[PDB]
Amino acid sequence: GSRSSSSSAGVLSPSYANILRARNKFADALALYEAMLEKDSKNVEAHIGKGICLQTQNKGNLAFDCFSEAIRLDPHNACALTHCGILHKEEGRLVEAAESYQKALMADASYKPAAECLAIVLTDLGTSLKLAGNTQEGIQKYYEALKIDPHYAPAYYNLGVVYSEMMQYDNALSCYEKAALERPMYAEAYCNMGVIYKNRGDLEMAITCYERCLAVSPNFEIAKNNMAIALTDLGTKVKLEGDVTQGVAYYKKALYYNWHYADAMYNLGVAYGEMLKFDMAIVFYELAFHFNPHCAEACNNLGVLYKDRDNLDKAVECYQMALSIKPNFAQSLNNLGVVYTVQGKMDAAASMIEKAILANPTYAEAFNNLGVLYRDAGNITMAIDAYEECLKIDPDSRNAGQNRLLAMNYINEGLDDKLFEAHRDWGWRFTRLHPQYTSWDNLKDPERPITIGYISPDFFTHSVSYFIEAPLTHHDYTKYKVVVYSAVVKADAKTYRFRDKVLKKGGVWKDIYGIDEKKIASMVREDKIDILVELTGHTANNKLGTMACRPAPVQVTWIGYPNTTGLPTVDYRITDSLADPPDTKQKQVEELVRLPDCFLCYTPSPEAGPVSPTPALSNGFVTFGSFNNLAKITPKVLQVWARILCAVPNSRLVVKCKPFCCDSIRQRFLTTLEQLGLESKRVDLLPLILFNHDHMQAYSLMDISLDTFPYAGTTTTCESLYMGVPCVTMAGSVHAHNVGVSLLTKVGLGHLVAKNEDEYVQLSVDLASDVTALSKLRMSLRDLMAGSPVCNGPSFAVGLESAYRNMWKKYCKGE
Amino acid sequence: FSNGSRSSSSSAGVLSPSNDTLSYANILRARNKFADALALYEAMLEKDSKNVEAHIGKGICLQTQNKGNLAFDCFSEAIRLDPHNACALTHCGILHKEEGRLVEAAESYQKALMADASYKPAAECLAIVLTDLGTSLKLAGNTQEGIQKYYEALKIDPHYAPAYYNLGVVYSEMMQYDNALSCYEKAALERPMYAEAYCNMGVIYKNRGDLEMAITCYERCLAVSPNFEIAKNNMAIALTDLGTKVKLEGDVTQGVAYYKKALYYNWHYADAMYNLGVAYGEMLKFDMAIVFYELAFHFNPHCAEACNNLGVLYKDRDNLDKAVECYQMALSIKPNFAQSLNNLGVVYTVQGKMDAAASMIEKAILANPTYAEAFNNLGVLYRDAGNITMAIDAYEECLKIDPDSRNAGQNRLLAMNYINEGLDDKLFEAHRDWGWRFTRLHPQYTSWDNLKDPERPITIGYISPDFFTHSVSYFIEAPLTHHDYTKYKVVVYSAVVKADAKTYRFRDKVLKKGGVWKDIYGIDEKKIASMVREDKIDILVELTGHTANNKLGTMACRPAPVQVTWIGYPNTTGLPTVDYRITDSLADPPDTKQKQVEELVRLPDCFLCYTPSPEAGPVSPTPALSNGFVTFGSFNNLAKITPKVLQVWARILCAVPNSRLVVKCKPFCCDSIRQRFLTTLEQLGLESKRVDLLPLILFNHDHMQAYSLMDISLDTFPYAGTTTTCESLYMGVPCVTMAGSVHAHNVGVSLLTKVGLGHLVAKNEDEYVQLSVDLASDVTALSKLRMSLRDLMAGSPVCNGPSFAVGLESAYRNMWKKYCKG
Numbered sequence A: 001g002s003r004s005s006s007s008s009a010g011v012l013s014p015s016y017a018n019i020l021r022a023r024n025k026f027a028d029a030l031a032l033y034e035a036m037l038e039k040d041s042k043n044v045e046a047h048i049g050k051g052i053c054l055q056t057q058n059k060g061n062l063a064f065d066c067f068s069e070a071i072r073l074d075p076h077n078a079c080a081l082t083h084c085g086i087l088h089k090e091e092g093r094l095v096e097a098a099e100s101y102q103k104a105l106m107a108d109a110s111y112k113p114a115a116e117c118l119a120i121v122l123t124d125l126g127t128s129l130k131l132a133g134n135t136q137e138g139i140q141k142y143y144e145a146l147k148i149d150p151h152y153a154p155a156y157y158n159l160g161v162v163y164s165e166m167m168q169y170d171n172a173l174s175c176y177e178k179a180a181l182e183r184p185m186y187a188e189a190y191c192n193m194g195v196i197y198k199n200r201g202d203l204e205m206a207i208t209c210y211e212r213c214l215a216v217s218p219n220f221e222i223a224k225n226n227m228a229i230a231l232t233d234l235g236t237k238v239k240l241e242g243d244v245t246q247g248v249a250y251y252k253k254a255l256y257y258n259w260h261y262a263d264a265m266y267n268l269g270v271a272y273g274e275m276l277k278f279d280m281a282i283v284f285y286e287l288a289f290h291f292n293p294h295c296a297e298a299c300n301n302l303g304v305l306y307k308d309r310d311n312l313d314k315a316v317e318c319y320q321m322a323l324s325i326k327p328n329f330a331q332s333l334n335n336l337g338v339v340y341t342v343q344g345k346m347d348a349a350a351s352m353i354e355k356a357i358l359a360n361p362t363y364a365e366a367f368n369n370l371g372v373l374y375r376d377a378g379n380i381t382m383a384i385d386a387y388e389e390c391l392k393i394d395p396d397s398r399n400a401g402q403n404r405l406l407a408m409n410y411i412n413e414g415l416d417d418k419l420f421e422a423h424r425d426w427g428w429r430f431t432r433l434h435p436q437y438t439s440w441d442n443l444k445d446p447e448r449p450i451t452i453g454y455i456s457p458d459f460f461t462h463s464v465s466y467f468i469e470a471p472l473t474h475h476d477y478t479k480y481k482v483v484v485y486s487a488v489v490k491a492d493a494k495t496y497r498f499r500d501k502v503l504k505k506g507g508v509w510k511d512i513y514g515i516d517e518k519k520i521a522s523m524v525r526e527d528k529i530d531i532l533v534e535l536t537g538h539t540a541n542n543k544l545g546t547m548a549c550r551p552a553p554v555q556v557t558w559i560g561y562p563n564t565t566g567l568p569t570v571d572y573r574i575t576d577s578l579a580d581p582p583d584t585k586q587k588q589v590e591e592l593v594r595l596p597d598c599f600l601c602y603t604p605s606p607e608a609g610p611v612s613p614t615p616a617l618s619n620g621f622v623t624f625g626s627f628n629n630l631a632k633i634t635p636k637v638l639q640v641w642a643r644i645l646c647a648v649p650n651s652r653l654v655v656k657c658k659p660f661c662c663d664s665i666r667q668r669f670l671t672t673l674e675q676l677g678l679e680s681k682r683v684d685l686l687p688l689i690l691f692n693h694d695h696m697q698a699y700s701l702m703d704i705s706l707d708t709f710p711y712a713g714t715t716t717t718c719e720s721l722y723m724g725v726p727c728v729t730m731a732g733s734v735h736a737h738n739v740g741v742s743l744l745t746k747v748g749l750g751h752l753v754a755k756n757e758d759e760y761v762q763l764s765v766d767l768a769s770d771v772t773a774l775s776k777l778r779m780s781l782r783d784l785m786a787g788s789p790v791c792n793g794p795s796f797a798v799g800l801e802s803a804y805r806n807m808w809k810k811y812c813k814g815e
Numbered sequence B: 001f002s003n004g005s006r007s008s009s010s011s012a013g014v015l016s017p018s019n020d021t022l023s024y025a026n027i028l029r030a031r032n033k034f035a036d037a038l039a040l041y042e043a044m045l046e047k048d049s050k051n052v053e054a055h056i057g058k059g060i061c062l063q064t065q066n067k068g069n070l071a072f073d074c075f076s077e078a079i080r081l082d083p084h085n086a087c088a089l090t091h092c093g094i095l096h097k098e099e100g101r102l103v104e105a106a107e108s109y110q111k112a113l114m115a116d117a118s119y120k121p122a123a124e125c126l127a128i129v130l131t132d133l134g135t136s137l138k139l140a141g142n143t144q145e146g147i148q149k150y151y152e153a154l155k156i157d158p159h160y161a162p163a164y165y166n167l168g169v170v171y172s173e174m175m176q177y178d179n180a181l182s183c184y185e186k187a188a189l190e191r192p193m194y195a196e197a198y199c200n201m202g203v204i205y206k207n208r209g210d211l212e213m214a215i216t217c218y219e220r221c222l223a224v225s226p227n228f229e230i231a232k233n234n235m236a237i238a239l240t241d242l243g244t245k246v247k248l249e250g251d252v253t254q255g256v257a258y259y260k261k262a263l264y265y266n267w268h269y270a271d272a273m274y275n276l277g278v279a280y281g282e283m284l285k286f287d288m289a290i291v292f293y294e295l296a297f298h299f300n301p302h303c304a305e306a307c308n309n310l311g312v313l314y315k316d317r318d319n320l321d322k323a324v325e326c327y328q329m330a331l332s333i334k335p336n337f338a339q340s341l342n343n344l345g346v347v348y349t350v351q352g353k354m355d356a357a358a359s360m361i362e363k364a365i366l367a368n369p370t371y372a373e374a375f376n377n378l379g380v381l382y383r384d385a386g387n388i389t390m391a392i393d394a395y396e397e398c399l400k401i402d403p404d405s406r407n408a409g410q411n412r413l414l415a416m417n418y419i420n421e422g423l424d425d426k427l428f429e430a431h432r433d434w435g436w437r438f439t440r441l442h443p444q445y446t447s448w449d450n451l452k453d454p455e456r457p458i459t460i461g462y463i464s465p466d467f468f469t470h471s472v473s474y475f476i477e478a479p480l481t482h483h484d485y486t487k488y489k490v491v492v493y494s495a496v497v498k499a500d501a502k503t504y505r506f507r508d509k510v511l512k513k514g515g516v517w518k519d520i521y522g523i524d525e526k527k528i529a530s531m532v533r534e535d536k537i538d539i540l541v542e543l544t545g546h547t548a549n550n551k552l553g554t555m556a557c558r559p560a561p562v563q564v565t566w567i568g569y570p571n572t573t574g575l576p577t578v579d580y581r582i583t584d585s586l587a588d589p590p591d592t593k594q595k596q597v598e599e600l601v602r603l604p605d606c607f608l609c610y611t612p613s614p615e616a617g618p619v620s621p622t623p624a625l626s627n628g629f630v631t632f633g634s635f636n637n638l639a640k641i642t643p644k645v646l647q648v649w650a651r652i653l654c655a656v657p658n659s660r661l662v663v664k665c666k667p668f669c670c671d672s673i674r675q676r677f678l679t680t681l682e683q684l685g686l687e688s689k690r691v692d693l694l695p696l697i698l699f700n701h702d703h704m705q706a707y708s709l710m711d712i713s714l715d716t717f718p719y720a721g722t723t724t725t726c727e728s729l730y731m732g733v734p735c736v737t738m739a740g741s742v743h744a745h746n747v748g749v750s751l752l753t754k755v756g757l758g759h760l761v762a763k764n765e766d767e768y769v770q771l772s773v774d775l776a777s778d779v780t781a782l783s784k785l786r787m788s789l790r791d792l793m794a795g796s797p798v799c800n801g802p803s804f805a806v807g808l809e810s811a812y813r814n815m816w817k818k819y820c821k822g
C-alpha cells in the first residue's frame, strides 16, 4: 500500500518601521525593531527587520542568530527562510542555502525572492559541477534553475558555454539569444555569439553581435580584439570581390578597435600599393612589421616598393629581413635575385632564383628572370631554356614569350624558318587574347596632312633615341604631324629635350606610362592617329598589346627589333634594300617597306668629344675592340676574333660589357679565349662606366672595332664610326646580320663589309697593316659620314615621309 | 755694403732627348694587369740598371702586391738617378701618406710640383693631404691654423670639394652661416654628389627659418644618398614643422600631406603622428584620429598631449572609464597639465563625484589662472550641486577673464532666474547688457528681401536643439501637429545633438503636413542665419533662450525680419534683434513691473500647450491610505530648490506631523550632496528620518509612475516648475504653487488657473504653507482629486492644440501686420 494525505486548513490568519527600511533608513528602523522586541519578544517581523539591517552592516554572525530566532518563532515564513539561505550562501554553505530557499517556496510559492535566490545558487552549483567534468549533471542543474526562475539569464549563458564547449553551436546560440532577451545588457553573451558566428563563416552577423557587446561594455578588450579580427577578415573579403575602398574602410575601423593589429596594417599597405599610393603604403608596411616582427610579407612588399624607387640598397635589406624570417619565401628569393641581376652579382643572382624555383616549382616569372640573367651573361642557349621552361608552366607568359623571340636572334643565322614560325605562332596566340577594332573613322583622302604616332618606352637616353631624334627634329609637322606615346619608365634630360622640341614644333606628347595597352589603344582613336608606328618590337616595355587591337588604320614597326613582330595586326616594317635585300629568304609577317638609302639615321650627342688619336702610334701595337652586348658575342665570334689576333703579332683585344664587373664572367670569358689560343695578357675585359662622355671617349683605347654576328651592332657601330674607329662587319642571310652592311656601305666604307669569315679575318688584319692609313681614316670618318645620308636628317625624312604617304595612299584605296 | 742675397740667374740644362716594352707594360698596368707588367719592368732593369721608369713601374706593381718598403726602395733609387721626376716624387709622397707620415707626403708633393708645375697628380694629392692636416688641426683645437690649411689646398687645387666642405663645417661652428653656406655651395658645385654638403646646408636653412629651402637641400641630399639616416630624420622634422606652419595659415589639407610625407621619411616620428590626430580630429574624423594619437603615444610615451586628446575623444563617446584612464596618464607625464586637470574634473562632474571634480577644476585654474572654461565648468559643477550663488560667482570670475564667453554669460543669466525675486531691475539690465555685447559681435543683416504683403503666405521658423525627449518637446509637439501650413508653412531648424524616437516622429509629422525639416547640427549660426534667408523665413521663433545649445547667434544676425522667443527660457533674451515674446496674461500680467527687451505678446489661455507622453501609464491611488502618513515632495531641479523654499517646506513638515519629504534629483546619486541637503534640512527642524532623496530614475515610464510615491507636490519659487507640475498634474498629484513678481514665478499660476484648480494658487509664504496642510488633512478628498485631475486638464485649454493654434497664428500674422506697415 501507498500513503496518501488530506490537508486541513489552519486558523484564520488574523485581521512605520518597515516603510523606513524600504527607503534605506537602516538605523532608524533598527531602533523601532529593538523597541518592538522589548515590547513583544515574539513579533517575528522585528527579528527579520533587525537581521536585514545588521546584514547591511556586514554583521552576518548576528544576523543568522536572529533569523533563526524568527524561524523558531514562526516557521513557514518565506522572508525569514529566504534570508537565512542568503546568509548560508554568503558564508559558503551553498546546499544548506538551497534547502532554506526550498522550504521558503513551500511556505509561499508566490514569494519570487526565494525563486530568484534558489535559481542563482543552483546555477552556481551547476557551474561548479562543470569544472569538475560532471558536465551532464551540471547541465541538468542549470535546467532546474530555469524551472525555478525561467528569467534568470546567467543560467542560459552558462548553458551556452558548455553547449559551445561540447560543439553544439546551434544549441549554444539559442541559449545565448534568450540570455540576451532576459538581459539586453549581457555583453558576454553577445561576444560569445559573435565568436560562433565568426568561426561559422558569417562575419557580418559576428560584427553586429560584437557591436551589441561593445555598446554594453566599450572596454571589453577580448571583444575589441575579436572585433578588429572580424573587421579585417571582412575587409579582405570585400576587397577580393572588387571593392577596394570599402575594404580599406573596414581596415581603418579595425584599427580603431585595435590600433596595433598588424594584419590591418599590412593589408592597408597592400591596398594602398594597389592604389598606386606607394609613399603611404611604405608607412603601413613598416608599422605592420614593427608590431609583427614575423610579417615577412611586409618586408617583401617594402623591398618591391623601394626597388621601384631605385633604392636597391634598401630593397636588399628588406628582402634580407624577409628571408631571415621565412628562408624559403619564394618571392623574396626571386626579388633579391632580380636586384642582384641588376647589380651585376651574377652568381648570387642565380643562386637566389634557383632557390626561388625550388620553393615554388611553378614560379614561372622566376624562370623568366633566370633566363634574363643567363642572357645578360651572354649564355643564350640556357637563357632560351629558362624561357621555354617558363612557357611550359605559363604558355601565355608575355615576358618569357617575347624574351625568347628576342633571345633567338642572338644565335639565329637563318637557314630555316623555325624563327619566323616562332614569331608567327606567338602572334596568333597573342592576337586572340586581344579584342581588335574592325572599323576606322579616318577620312580617306590621300594628300591630307597626316598625324603619325610613335609609341615607345625608349624616349630617354637609349639606343632607340639616337635614331628617333633625327625624325622628331627634321619631321615636317605642317603636313606630317607627330604624336608621341612615351612609355618612358624613368625620364631624363633627353626625354624633356625631345618633349620640349616636339611641343615647340606643334606635335602632341602623351605620357602613357602605367596605362593599360587597351586604353592606350582607344586614346589612339581619340587622337585620330593615322600612322601608328611602334619602335620596340619584342624588346623590354614594348606596347604590342596596343597594336594587337589595331587602333589605327595602318601600323608599322621600326628601329627597335631586328625581325618581324609576328603580329597580323601590323602591316608594314621599315627597312632598306641592303638590310633586307630583295632576294631575302627570311620570312616576315609584315610587308617590307624599303626606304631610300639607310633605314636608320644616327644623331650623335654633341658632348661625345673629338676624334682622339689612333692608339697604335703611341702603343706600338694594334688594339681590336667591340662595345656590343656580351649576348651578341657568340662563341663563333670569339673563334674569328682569335684568328684575327693570331694573325696580327702582339695585337690586343678590348671589350666593355656590364657583366664584366662580375669576375666569374670575366674569368670564364678569358678561359674560352685561352683554349682558343689567345692568352690573357692580350685581352682586356673592361667594366661598364656610367658617363656617356667617358664611354665615347673610351674609343681612345681601340684601333679597329669588330662587328658581331648573327646579331650585328646598330648604335655601337654608328658610335664607333663617329669616334673615328672603323668597323669590319660580316653580311648574312637575315636582317639582324645585315644592319652593319647597310650602315658601313651608305657611310662610304663598303669595302669593309665581309661576305664570310675568311674575308672578315683578312679585312681586319689588312686594316691593322698600314697604321698611317689608319690615322688618316680616323680623322676622315666623322666628317665623311656626318655628311653621309646616315647622319643627315632632312634627307631621310623625305623618303620616309614619302613612304608614309604611300602607306596612306594604299590604305585609302583599300589595299 | 752689408746686404742680403743677390738676384739669381738660371741657365737651362742639356736638351731633352729625341719604347715597345715600356708601352706594353704601362697599358698592362693601366688595366690592373699588374703581375704581367712587373715581369716586363724587371726585364728592363736587368738590361739597364738605371731605367728610372722601370724602377717606378716596378714600385707601383709591387705596392699593389702590398710590398711597401721594397716599393720605397725602388722609388728611392728612382729619385737618386733622376731627382726631378715628378712622377717618382709623387709616388714616394703617396707611400708616405699611406704609411701615416703625413708631413713627408706634402714634402715630396711640393718637390714634384717644383719639377713640373703642370703635373696634375701632384697638385691633387697635395690638396688631399693638406686638408687632412687641416682637419687634424681642427680636432686639436688650432682652428685658425686649420682654416689656412684648407685655403692652402684651395690655392693648389681650387676644384677639390672636401676643402670647401670642411671649410663650411668650421664656418658653421664659428656661426658664420653665410660663409658656411657659400663654402657648401662651392663644394656642391665642385662635387654635385656631395650629400653631406647638401645635408649641412639644409640644417642651416632650417635653423634660420627657411624650411622650404631646407627641404630642397635635404631633397638634393637624399637624391644622392636615399639612405642617409640623419638627413632622413631631419627631413621629417622639417616636413612636420612646415606642415604645422601651413596648417595655421588655414590650409589643413596640405598640412596633413606634409605630416604624411614626414612619416615616409621617418615612420615612427611621433610628432607627425600626434599632429595628424589633431588635424583629423578637426576634420571630425574621430576614429582615425584615435589611431594617430595612440601611435604617437606609443612611439613617444612622454607625449601627454596625445593622452589628453584621446580622453576627450572617448568622453564624447561617453566612454568615461577610458577617458579617466587617458587623463590620468597625461597627468602621469605632466602633473601640472591644465587641460587634463580640467577635463578629468569635467568627467568627475558628469559621474557625480562633485568634490573630486571641484578639486580637479581648481588645480586647472592654478595651472592656468586665466583658464576661462575651467571657471565655467566650476560654475556648472556648483549649479548641478545646487549652490547657485557660487555658480554665479564662478561664471562672473570667467567673465572677468573673457567678457564675451558665451557659456559663462548665458549660464549666468539662466542661473540668476533660480534665485532672483525681481524687486530691482538688475536681472533685466544684465540681460540687456549681454544683448548689447552679443550683438556687437554678430554682424546684423540690414536688408530683408522677404515680400511685404501683410496677408501673404508666410513661413514660420522654429529653431531649437530640444526636438528630442526633452522638456521643451512636450510643449512644441502641439503646434507641429496642428498648424495650417497653408498660409503659415512652418520650417524646423533642428539642432538636436542626439536624436531619438521622438525626433524621428517629429520630423515625420512636419514633412507629412507640408513643412521642411533641416538638421542644423554642427552648422555655424551665421551659416544657419543665411540658411534662414535661403528658406525665405518670415518669422523666426527660437525656443531655447539662454539654455544649452541655443542658437541665439543666428538670431543676433537678425536673418528673418520678425523674431520671437518662446517656451525654453523663462525671461527676456536681452537681444534687441528679437522683436516679440509669447506669454499669457496670467504668467505675465498687464501690470507687471518686470522689464523685457522684446514686446510681450500675451495670448488667450496658457502660453503653453502640453502634449503628454502616450505611454505614461494610469493614475495610481494616493499612498496616504496605505502608509498612514502624507508624503510631500518635488521632482524639480535641485537648483530650483532655494534655501528659502526649504525653510517654507520645513514649517510645512512641522505643521503636518509624522509626514515625510521626497525629492528626486540627479545630484542625489552622490551620497555626499545627498546628506548635505539632509543636514541643512535638519537644522531647519526636520531630521533625516522624515526625508527621502531619490536618485534620478532614467526610465520615463517609471518616472511618471514615481508620482505614486507622493500625495501632493510642492512648486518651487521664484523659478516655478513648467514640465514637472504639468507632469505631476497629469499623474493626478495636485501641486500648490506660489505666485510672485516675475514670469518664472507665475508659470504655475497660469498652469493651475487654466487647468481648473486655481484654489491651489498661493499668494505668499503663509498662504503657501496653510493651503498645503489644508489638503494634507482630508485624505478622502485627496482620493477624490487624484482620479479627477487627469480628465479635466485634458479638457482644459492647456492640452487642446487646435484652439491654441489659431491663437498662435493670429498673433503671428499680427506681427506680420506691423512689419509691412513700417
Ligand SMILES: Nc1nc2c(ncn2[C@@H]2O[C@H](COP(=O)(O)OP(=O)(O)O)[C@@H](O)[C@H]2O)c(=O)[nH]1
Pocket: B469, B470, B471, B472, B474, B635, B636, B637, B640, B664, B696, B697, B698, B699, B700, B703, B720, B721, B722, B723, B724, B725
Ligand atoms: N527619464 C527621466 N526623465 C526625467 C526624470 N526627471 C525629469 N525628467 C525629464 O526632465 C524634464 C524636467 O526638466 P525640468 O528642468 O525640471 O523642467 P521644469 O523645472 O518644469 O522647467 C521632464 O520633461 C522629464 O521628461 C527621470 O527621473 N527620468
